[PDB]
Amino acid sequence: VNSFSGYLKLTDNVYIKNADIVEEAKKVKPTVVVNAANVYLKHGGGVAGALNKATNNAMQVESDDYIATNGPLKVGGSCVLSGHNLAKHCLHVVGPNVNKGEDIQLLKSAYENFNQHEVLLAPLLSAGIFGADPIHSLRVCVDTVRTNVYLAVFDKNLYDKLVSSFL
Ligand X SMILES: O=C(O)Cc1noc2ccccc12
Q: How far is the CB of 136 from ligand X (least distance, A)?
A: 11
Q: How far is the CB of 94 from ligand X (least distance, A)?
A: 16
- Residue 123 interacts with ligand X (CB under 6 A): yes or no: yes
- Residue 120 interacts with ligand X (CB under 6 A): yes or no: no
- Residue 95 interacts with ligand X (CB under 6 A): yes or no: no
- Residue 155 interacts with ligand X (CB under 6 A): yes or no: yes
Nearer to ligand X, 63 or 137 (CB): 137
d(CA 27, CA 6): 13
Residues 83, 106, 128, 144: which binds ligand X (CB under 6 A)?
128
Nearer to ligand X, 35 or 56 (CB): 35
Residues 8, 135, 158, 163: which binds ligand X (CB under 6 A)?
158
- Residue 30 interacts with ligand X (CB under 6 A): yes or no: no
Residues that bind ligand X (CB under 6 A): 123-124, 127-128, 134, 153-155, 158
